[PDB]
Amino acid sequence: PQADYSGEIAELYDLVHQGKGKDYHREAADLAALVRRHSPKAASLLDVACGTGMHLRHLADSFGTVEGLELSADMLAIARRRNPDAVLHHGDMRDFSLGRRFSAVTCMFSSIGNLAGQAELDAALERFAAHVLPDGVVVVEPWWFPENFTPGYVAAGTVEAGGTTVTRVSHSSREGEATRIEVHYLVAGPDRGITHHEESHRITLFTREQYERAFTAAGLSVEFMPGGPSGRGLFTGLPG
Amino acid sequence: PQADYSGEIAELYDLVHQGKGKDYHREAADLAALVRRHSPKAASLLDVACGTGMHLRHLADSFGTVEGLELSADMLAIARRRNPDAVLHHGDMRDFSLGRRFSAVTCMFSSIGNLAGQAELDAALERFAAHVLPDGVVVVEPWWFPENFTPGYVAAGTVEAGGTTVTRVSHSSREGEATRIEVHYLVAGPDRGITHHEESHRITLFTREQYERAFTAAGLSVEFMPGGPSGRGLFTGLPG
Ligand SMILES: Cc1cn([C@H]2C[C@H](O)[C@@H](COP(=O)(O)OP(=O)(O)O[C@H]3O[C@H](C)[C@@H](O)[C@H](N)[C@H]3O)O2)c(=O)[nH]c1=O
Ligand SMILES: Cc1cn([C@H]2C[C@H](O)[C@@H](COP(=O)(O)OP(=O)(O)O[C@H]3O[C@H](C)[C@@H](O)[C@H](N)[C@H]3O)O2)c(=O)[nH]c1=O
Ligand SMILES: Nc1ncnc2c1ncn2[C@@H]1O[C@H](CSCC[C@H](N)C(=O)O)[C@@H](O)[C@H]1O
Ligand SMILES: Nc1ncnc2c1ncn2[C@@H]1O[C@H](CSCC[C@H](N)C(=O)O)[C@@H](O)[C@H]1O
């Protein structure tokens, strides 16, 4: 099964996350406000692992300039179509270099859990701090911690759009120091018939302290707020 | 994709048809009342293609002796477990010979559409007539008539039981004089993880006249009533 957010899996991403109730509007509003508490005059924002560019489309209404970075060509193409006047870069959060800084650097919906190892987590946070202005803010939404992840968790939901029915079912296990989440889809419509699709991801269960250490090593002060967009909390970092 | 009602598919059958809202309890009572209209003192009943024996389990409360016939060993295993004191035969509705006759011979939920052409349909009706008492009745629930079938129809539902979630989606097309219905499942539970299953059936769209021809050739009078347990109506046949 693919792990790379490509092809039909990428094409299905928006529909299934909206169908599950993800509200990128509220999240963007909440982000913009959190960003402004820490950095009252913030003007620009880079969203790293920006996926299909849903946060970016809403954040564009709150920030003068927004920009993205995304590893998967196929997610990125959706995001560019959604954000045709923003610059969105094809690149890797572990090692990119844009030559410019932003009032905010965000990395949402546990994209950071695609990293494996303290070294990768450290590298990425060093990048974020390399792209943040001196009076701005870095925001990283973590994955679950080892101690609060619920192994055996199943999600199942169905959404219909454009005449096509899409069912998504995930199962998640504790696979060592990461969550194995295996997701299957069935997609059906009168004219297209039925097709089955599948993806599978290891999403690293970093501990709180590992994130705190990566913020620290990057020069940032770090704070953690439990709950957050997805239940997993939110870490914010200020340069210093 | 299997076409033989076996393995996991046979194990998911009752749960999926329950989830879709099938009520074998009402259907058996309705069938018991139909049978006593045409044959007031009927006392025994053979359910042909009895599947998991859901009809028989309820028909046992209305008829003193029930018996089943079923082609899939795995469906039949479930039926026997459910109907421990009835005789349930492993065999083929086209060519079976039990050496006794019943007040009612029934064949429900369009199982008759698993037959390929007029010759098979005629042969199963003649076998039904061979197992019906002279003052008894044959009941056959047809598949859709060609004019009443909707190509492109999609069914999608998700049910959960025992912490296992089961999603079933089907899509149907016109294939020569039959419906091709392709059915996919996703089944996930905390311990067993997630799996995908699929089945596919060709169910013949016999016309009303083809059914009537088969009944009449078997020496049965024939009547069709629209509606019925599934929208497809019901044929009844009386010998003599
Ligand atoms: C409700 C809940 C879920 N979880 C875990 C179980 C599973 O690993 C995840 C929810 O899985 P989902 O709803 O199928 O996934 P979600 O929409 O959150 O997306 C997640 O996985 C997908 C594959 C990634 O692309 C995405 N970046 C992740 O947020 O969070 C918990 O640990 N505790 C919980 O209370
Ligand atoms: C309600 C309705 C159904 N149909 C046809 C379309 C499709 O082929 C079928 C319903 O699909 P389903 O609900 O997925 O199938 P159902 O539960 O009726 O079961 C049927 O297909 C399965 C595979 C057989 O084991 C079962 N013996 C059949 O009755 O019936 C129509 O053509 N028009 C309709 O309005
Ligand atoms: N090393 C890496 N650098 C950049 N993006 C990455 C990455 N590894 C995974 N990703 C991206 O991480 C995203 C995880 S899904 C989250 C997408 C988006 N942030 C949203 O909130 O909806 C995917 O788009 C995936 O391609
Ligand atoms: N030639 C044949 N003889 C007997 N059973 C058959 C058959 N072809 C298909 N079947 C059976 O037909 C059934 C269709 S599903 C309907 C099962 C059951 N009558 C119910 O109402 O739930 C399955 O059990 C299948 O194995």
Swiss-Prot record, chains A, B:
Annotated EC: 2.1.1.235
Example GO molecular function: protein homodimerization activity
Keyword Methyltransferase: yes
Pathway stated in the Swiss-Prot or TrEMBL entry: Antibiotic biosynthesis; tylosin biosynthesis
Biological processes annotated in GO: antibiotic biosynthetic process; methylation
Keywords: Antibiotic biosynthesis, Methyltransferase, S-adenosyl-L-methionine, Transferase
UniProt keyword Transmembrane helix present: no
Name of one Pfam family that matches: Methyltransf_25
The reaction(s) this protein catalyses: dTDP-3-amino-3,6-dideoxy-alpha-D-glucose + 2 S-adenosyl-L-methionine = dTDP-alpha-D-mycaminose + 2 S-adenosyl-L-homocysteine + 2 H(+)
Subunit comment: Homodimer.
Entries under PANTHER family matching the protein: METHYLTRANSFERASE, UBIQUINONE BIOSYNTHESIS O-METHYLTRANSFERASE, MITOCHONDRIAL
Domain notes: However, it is not conserved in related S.venezuelae DesVI methyltransferase and its mutagenesis does not completely abolish catalytic activity.
Family, similarity comment: Belongs to the methyltransferase TylM1/DesVI family.
Reported function: S-adenosyl-L-methionine-dependent methyltransferase involved in the biosynthesis of mycaminose, an essential structural component of the macrolide antibiotic tylosin. Involved in the last step in mycaminose biosynthesis by mediating dimethylation of the hexose C-3' amino group.
The name this protein goes by in its record: dTDP-3-amino-3,6-dideoxy-alpha-D-glucopyranose N,N-dimethyltransferase
Originating species: Streptomyces fradiae (Streptomyces roseoflavus)
